[PDB]
Amino acid sequence: MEVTHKQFDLSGFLPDQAPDTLKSGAISRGFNVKPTILGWEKSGGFRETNTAPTNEKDFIFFWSPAIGDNRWFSGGDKTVQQVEGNVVSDVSRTGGYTAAAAARWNAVNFNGVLLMNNELDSPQYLAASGKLEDFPNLPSNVRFRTVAVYKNFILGLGVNFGSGFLDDEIYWSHQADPGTMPPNWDYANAASDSGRTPLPSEGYCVTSEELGSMNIVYKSDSIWTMQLIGGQWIFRFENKFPGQGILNKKSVVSFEGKHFVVTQKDIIVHDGYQVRSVADKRVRNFFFTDMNSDYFERVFVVKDPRVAEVYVFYPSKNSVDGLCDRALVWNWRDDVWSLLNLRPLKHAAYGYEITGVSITWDNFVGGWESTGLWQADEDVAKYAPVLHYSFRDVPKLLAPTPQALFIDEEIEAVWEREDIVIGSISRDGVPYQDYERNKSVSSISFDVDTTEPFDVYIGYKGSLEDSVEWEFAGTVNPMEDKRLFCLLTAGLFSMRIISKAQTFILRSYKITYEFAGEMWA
């Protein structure tokens, strides 16, 4: 007359399924709790990092001119900045950058030279002068949307100079010299190798042609391929998948060995020859229907190289600034999903920070003793591409931290299984739930590795046709006790778990009950 259920069969965040038929350990509604091998885990807590922009932080990015160097650029209206040493700003173009640009620039990586492009301003590159400047032979009339990179070929982009912003692409480069754009770029002239191509299609090619060792591919609203093996006119215009179209610029595909693709319709994974949706029957519906984004853009996705996770920051209907305040998390190493809730945030990226006190040291002494070469610090994390989040409401940035505390306040956690498979247990170890038999609770006991307490709320419902109703039960510290007593009877069984704790480790649970009647209403 008892059922014990466990949470290490590694099911994902599964809200779209028929929630009553969910297998053991499946989650109905989640709040930023991480499903892991050992069990449910807390993935939260943030250290305060040393970077400081002292200005508007719309786009942030990490790059280095040499080993041991860490530089960052913060761009805003009229303004792009620097984050290095202890001084900022004064890298933006000569004039006021352009008319109140906001969340509409772009950043790309090509060799060691850093490149930035904006919708409203011509592309400027950074050189030894320290001032962003336009390309050498590119005529002034031009104005550009988005830029991209490829093998020794800079500016794999798709927008013309002006009056023709719709559907374009130009091989701006030639066989480039690593570290500088080609001395000329001429397309119509037959000096070397360059040209302009239509690439006919109904949709508008929007952003970079993505990645892949063998070749790079992307889409306007159906995927197109590029391969430079030919010699007559290099590259071969070709297409792959007509159906798939992409919704947003920053809805980018990942740099992982596999490609993580988000579309208007579904979420698909492929590498050029075979395709499949990453989660069709599990995640597709909730991701889109959580809200009509209604601000389609500003939805961006990054990677987490350290742990096999990828985060898609998405707006909440409740959210009104258009900021995501929420993020979809999927594990690429194993097919499990998770969902998070966070403070309002604007943009995010990964990188490293090495800051420490430097020029104020005590002994003016001679150069026969060791500096230690700027010794100490996250020397370990230099390999670790820790993420950096441009939180909307803080001047200083932060980075993730195992101890689930934001700065000094703590972040919430909620665990919800709307209904449980409870009832007759058949020949197989796993039970099957009988709807017809109404049932009474006896007791609850939880398997936890931590020591911090967690609160528990209990839900009840009359019939499946009826909705859900809520009740709260006082928490219990696991150190002294493992069980709680309550008496109730309903149609289906609901418990709601909330935790304000440093660490949460859920393993399994057991429920005692008895068949004492049948279904009425």
- Residue 285 phi, psi dihedral angles, 5° rounding: -70, -45
Shortest CA distance to 432 belongs to which of 22, 10, 31, 7?
Answer: 22
Contact between 294 and a copy of itself per CB under 8 A: yes
Residues 295-334 interacting with a copy of itself (rule: CB under 8 A): 296, 305-306, 333
Instruction: Return the residue of 445, 473, 489, 515 that touches a copy of itself, per CB under 8 A.
Output: 445
Stretch that binds a copy of itself, among 40-48, 50-58, 119-127, 449-457 (CB under 8 A): 449-457
Q: Using CB under 8 A, which of 1, 9, 21, 233 touches a copy of itself? A: 21
| Cβ at position 360, least distance to a copy of itself in Å | 26
DSSP string over 31-57: ESEEE-SSSEEE---EEE-S---SS--
Q: What angle do CA 223, 226, 228 make, to 5 degrees?
A: 170
The residue count for binding a copy of itself (CB under 8 A) is 72
Task: Give Cα separations from 82 to 87, 125, 243 (angstroms).
Answer: 7, 14, 42
Nearer to a copy of itself by C-beta: 363 or 371? 371
Q: Does 4 bind a copy of itself (CB under 8 A)?
A: yes
Report the C-alpha gap between 103 and 327 in whole angstroms: 18
At its nearest, how many Å lie between a copy of itself and the CB of residue 466? 7
**How far apart are alpha carbons 230 and 282 in whole angstroms?**
43
Q: Minimum Å distance from CB 137 to a copy of itself?
A: 23
Strands (E), 207-355: 216-219, 223-226, 238-239, 259-262, 267-270, 275-277, 301-304, 309-313, 326-331, 336-341, 345-350
Q: Per-residue x/- mask for a copy of itself, residues 61 to 100, rule CB under 8 A?
A: ---x-xx---------------------------------
Does residue 414 belong to the site contacting a copy of itself (CB under 8 A)? no
The token pair that represents 360 in the structure block: 């104020």
418-437 positions binding a copy of itself, by CB under 8 A: 426, 429, 435-436
393 is an interface residue for a copy of itself by CB under 8 A: no
Q: Which stretch binds a copy of itself (CB under 8 A): 45-53, 117-125, 290-298, 348-356?
A: 290-298
Cβ-Cβ contacts under 8 Å for 437 (sequence gap 6 or more): 423, 515, 517, 518, 519
Q: Output 139 or 517, the one with its CB closest to a copy of itself.
A: 517
Range 159-178, binding a copy of itself (CB under 8 A):
166, 178
The window from 124-132, 403-411, 415-423, 472-480 that contacts a copy of itself (CB under 8 A) reads 472-480
| Minimum separation from the CB atom of position 53 to a copy of itself (A) | 23
For residue 263, the minimal CB distance to a copy of itself (Å) is: 9
Q: Contact between 204 and a copy of itself (CB under 8 A)?
A: yes
What DSSP string runs through 112-166? TEEEEEESSS--EE--TTSS-EE-SSS-TT---S---EETTEE-EE---SSS--S
| 88 vs 421 by CB, closer to a copy of itself | 421
Binder of a copy of itself out of 472, 482, 486, 517 (CB under 8 A): 482
List of residues 6+ apart from 405 with CB closer than 8 A: 45, 46, 411, 502
The reply to whether 280 sits near a copy of itself by the rule CB under 8 A is yes
Question: Is position 47 an interface residue for a copy of itself (rule: CB under 8 A)?
Answer: no
**Range in contact with a copy of itself (rule: CB under 8 A) among 32-40, 72-80, 124-132, 407-415:** 32-40
Edge-first strand order for the sheet with 113-118 is 105-110, 113-118, 124-125, 133-134
Helix/strand/coil for 457? strand
- Tracing tokens 């982009």 back to the chain, one arrives at 157
Shortest approach of a copy of itself to residue 453 CB, angstroms? 11
